Each structure stands twice: as C-alpha cells, then as structure tokens.
C-alpha cells in the first residue's frame, strides 16, 4: 500500500554531539531504523535523514539483517566521516514503533 522510496546516499560529519540520531530495531525481525534526530545536530542538518528511515548500510557495511548492537557498535566505529545508505520506509516503521 504505501510504497518505500529507493535508497539515497547521506555524508554526515561527526561533531561534539556525535551523529545526532537514535536508532531502534535490530531485534527479531525488524530492521535498523533512524528514530530520533537531535534538533541542530549533524543528521538534522543533512537535510536527508529522518524518524522512519531504514540504514542499509554504514561506510559500506551492510546492516540490512543487523542486531541492534552490531549497528550501534558500526556507528561508533565509523569514524569522522560517516557514510548512510538510507531508505525512508515509513509503513514498515509504523508497523513496529
């Protein structure tokens, strides 16, 4: 019914209050979802990212089928330059938060 949009590419750059997001899911099923996005914070400032995107993958790291702890641990090790292939699915996101 409610049709994903196709994937997009977001740089990001880490500052002083990190990447500036939550993410939820990573546990039995549900995908790696952006659920939160801090108010001036880098992903806020993308002007891309937003609460129902999907990460597919972190500087090339596939987290389609990822635990939440293994996508909270890629996130943290991804350096100062961070890489998202994002796909903002919001039907699926609603269906579990």
């Not at 952006?34 to 090339?60: C, H, M, T, W, Y």
Request: glycine share 14%; no cysteine.
């Amino acid at each position: 019914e409610d049709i994903p949009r196709e994937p997009r590419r977001i740089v990001i750059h880490r500052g002083s209050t990190g990447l500036g997001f939550n993410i939820v899911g990573g546990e039995n099923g549900e995908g790696i979802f952006i659920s939160f996005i801090l108010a001036g914070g880098p992903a806020d400032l993308s002007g891309e990212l937003r609460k129902g995107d999907q990460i597919l993958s972190v500087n090339g790291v596939d987290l389609r089928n990822a635990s939440h702890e293994q996508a909270a641990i890629a996130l943290k090790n991804a350096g100062q330059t961070v890489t998202i292939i994002a796909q903002y699915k919001p039907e699926e996101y609603s269906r579990f938060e």
